[PDB]
Amino acid sequence: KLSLQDVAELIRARACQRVVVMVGAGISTPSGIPDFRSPGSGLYSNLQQYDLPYPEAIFELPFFFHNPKPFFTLAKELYPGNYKPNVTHYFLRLLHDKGLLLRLYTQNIDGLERVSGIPASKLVEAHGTFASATCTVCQRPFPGEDIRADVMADRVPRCPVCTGVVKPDIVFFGEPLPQRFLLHVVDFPMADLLLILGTSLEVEPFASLTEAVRSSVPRLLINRDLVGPLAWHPRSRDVAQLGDVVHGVESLVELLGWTEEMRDLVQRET
Template identity: 30%
Template sequence: MAANTVKSTEGIHCIANSNPCIKTLENDVLSVLKSSKRIIVLAGAGMSVSCGIPDFRSADGLYNTLDLEELGLNCPEDLFDMESFIENPSSFYKFAKRLYPGNVQPSLTHKFLALLQKKNKLLRVYTQNIDGLEVEAGVTSKKVVYAHGSLAVAQCLKCNLKFDAKHIATEVNEGKVPTCVSASRTVKKKGSLKRKGSQQKSNTMEDSNKRGEKNVSDLGTGTLSPKSKRLKRRAATRHNGTRDDLTSERSDDVEDEVGVDPKNYPNNNICGGLIKPGVTFFGEKLEDRVGKALEADREKVDALLVIGTSLSVSPMSKVLRYLPPSIPRILINRNEVVLPKMCADEIDSDDEEDTRDGYIFDASLLGNCDDVVKGIMCALAWKIEEGLESTTLAEPCGSDTGLTEVVGRNYFFPGALVVSLEEDEYEEEIVHCDGCRKKIATNVVMKCTQCFDFDLCYECFPKVSKKHYRGRHKFKSEKI
């Protein structure tokens, strides 16, 4: 789509807050919000821009404003790359300290999600954000699925201990790279757990050292041995928990409690491993909970809100084609969204055909997320203060919704951009095989047609597909 143009098949409906304009908004959007009881929200970075957190791809977004020299990065994408994090974790922590829990307050849009929950209209929030502001705003943690992980939790890459981010808050806010200070431990071997320094020290580790192999402590230096790579992969497995259910959680492979005082042990014997935030870095596979939650919610959802995201990162860009095409879809974003061709072409499910002709969303509310949400709430006469403390609107809106123009299915609010993303601006998809857990190097993958994100490489397909749901699920080849 060319710049400064708006795609429309129905022409201009109205301008400003005229009665026809409000009536159109009522028919296309407000009626859906009034009648729906099980809304799924796909949330993106645009929700948090008003909180002082930049989005990724806009002119003043993260990718265009990041000081690469200051952070020691070659390109913006390195900030969320696992290998780059291992080599230079200070880059990530210098940037991320402003996002950590307690340093940022929720926006009006975050509070709007909590209001949907209070009105018993919210089924689930699938957020691509890592700031945890949905829960801060009042959405219960059980209704939030972190597609890309959360800063609210962290994990030691050496001993695999998982814990609440508050344990590293001091170091992060001081710009330091946090390391694990719990009592030193080793990983289980064949059912036994041995502490370093004990008389039961494993001969396996000694033999490994004699052969010149590096042990897991190398994770703190950036040098990875085969063993430490295996541990790193296990440690990098995403966990979509929240502060409540992951506080002081520990891996099954370790003992002791989080926050153990190292002074209680001889020779100050502490772990010292590098701590990785609980976020999903580029190239990592989504945690199983994302797919399982979508598979369960698919049968319940009655409306979809896409807020503050261009849906340019897979596999979340495929959610639209996975959910039933019959449900209403509403977009709240600064600009229109164009799905990758593969997602747009295959948006029909096995059971239903998408009757939309030439469009994806039933209504696109274009503008700053907070301005759009404020307009919706004014039109619905909803008030944020209903049961939510200290979350009132900044000022009364009266009958002014902020809506300036309606063109086709596009509704324009303050901050709207009339330039759509081109298909080639979308992130290249990285797919991991759910059989061997390796990155699929070919451009074709065998995908389960009934699961949201279950993929197999050609090598694993013959055997694993027969075990997957006892062979009852169908697979199809798909280009990536």
């Protein structure tokens, strides 16, 4: 029943005022960051021709314990400022600036939400952060900058106490998510609109958050395809804007009448 224009009018008329957002790697491929579960001829093609058996192994603990070097090549590549946010991030920034953003839940570890100017208090980086690290042998914690010099020098960082490999607090497969993830217990019942951008919804427990909003809440998917619970268990007020994520965001921006703000924001930032 609901269209993208309907959602735009709900926002314009302040009928939807507390927006929660879920994003994955699909919002950052337009910035040049390949999706580790849908890679191309760039970073992951080169590592797979050196010592990476498959891309998901970068985030698997058994492989890391065997050869941590592929992961740290990726860590070096994701140093903030190596990539710039694209229109998708700055749209989320605009949501925040206009007082509509309750929380932005991201599966990405590229830090582009923060680079776009969204405050940390609005963010839940559900798949971890490079801001801290943990020795894989003795479990001592370390500030993330204590290993940066090593990573940028193509050195595997090691613990000063036991010499084990120190791993950034990125959430690997088989690991729990940060406790800040549990903000969803209150954030999602309180949302009156859910936006889902650029994700496959194939990674749990993050994906199941799409079911945590109330049945009254529209769920707007801006993605190349209809995916996850949105595809198998649709709700009456779901909306799918399918295609290039940038074109879908730009279409919503135009329907919101935010084109001029977006242009102002981008030039002031870029």
